[PDB]
């Protein structure tokens, strides 16, 4: 075990690489593309 009307995110092998897919998603924006302009 590693870390934590509930949920539990538990790492059995105690490595960050040994975890499954990373489902926690924040970063995004299309604008790096589709609008890559100064002004």
């Amino acid at each position: 075990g590693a870390q934590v009307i509930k949920y539990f995110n538990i790492n059995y092998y105690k490595d960050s690489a040994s975890s499954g897919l990373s489902r926690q998603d924040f970063s995004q924006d299309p604008s790096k593309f589709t609008q890559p302009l100064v002004d």
Partner: protein, 255 residues
């Protein structure tokens, strides 16, 4: 308005028929920070003497011309004190301001794709498994006139692929818009400006062995004279290094 002025020290571009500037990935060139650094030695920043517009040789754009590419930093290796800093250092980084210039007339028709490809790894001109030679992927300021697809292209000497439809790498032109690009439509604008930051998974690498970017100008629609006797128009490319760094001073890697 369509007017634009870009002053990078010692030199000034003035574009009176212009689009917005493409800022690649919404990212301006920065100096390598301390968080991202690898090598322990204090780098050199040449600033105004290296960072400035270097205009290359013009290329004649004609009926039937398939396109051109330049490799960066390669195209600048002989240019001013920027090119001197490439040979005397292990490593270097830089961003670039690429300004492409083609003007014709309101009687001319044509379109050019001006794109900047990170890590543009060419394909061998055909056949068996051969690395494209160092000599061919480093033409210098002259760049490479794309010739065209043929069964008769010489396959000797590890030559690169000549077919612009496949981007010389085996992927369709027309998807090249995923890279920083602008179109020069003679009806609309006579120029283009792309500000690319330093793109790499490495903080700095060898300026001579690795070509970070590639500037590719493809004639998307051919050049029609209209009613004029002008069947060809020049295309001038002008590059400004920006926020260029160099570290690992040594003997010049030149001959």
């Amino acid at each position: 308005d369509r007017l634009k002025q870009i002053t990078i020290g010692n030199s000034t571009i003035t574009t009176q028929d212009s689009l917005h500037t493409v800022l690649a990935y919404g990212e301006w060139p920065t100096y390598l920070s301390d968080i991202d650094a690898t090598s322990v030695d204090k780098p050199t920043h040449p600033e105004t003497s290296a960072d400035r517009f270097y205009t290359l040789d013009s290329v004649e754009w004609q009926v039937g011309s398939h396109g051109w590419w330049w490799k960066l930093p390669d195209a600048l290796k002989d240019m001013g004190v920027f090119g001197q800093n490439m040979y005397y250092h292990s490593m270097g980084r830089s961003g670039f301001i690429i300004h492409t210039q083609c003007n014709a007339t309101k009687f001319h028709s044509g379109a050019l794709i001006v794109a900047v490809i990170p890590e543009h790894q060419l394909a061998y001109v055909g056949g068996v498994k051969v690395n494209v030679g160092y000599d061919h992927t480093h033409p210098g300021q002259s760049g490479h006139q794309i010739r065209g697809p043929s069964q008769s292209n010489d396959r000797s000497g590890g030559k690169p692929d000549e077919d612009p439809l496949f981007n010389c790498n085996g992927t369709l032109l027309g998807n090249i818009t995923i890279f920083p690009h602008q179109i020069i439509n003679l009806r609309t604008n006579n120029s283009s400006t792309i500000v690319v930051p330093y793109i790499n998974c490495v903080p700095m690498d060898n300026m001579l062995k690795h070509n970070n970017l590639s500037l590719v100008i493809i004639p998307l629609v051919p050049l029609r004279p209209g009613s004029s006797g002008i069947n060809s128009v020049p295309i001038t490319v002008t590059i400004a290094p920006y926020k260029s760094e160099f570290s690992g001073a040594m003997e010049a890697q030149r001959q």
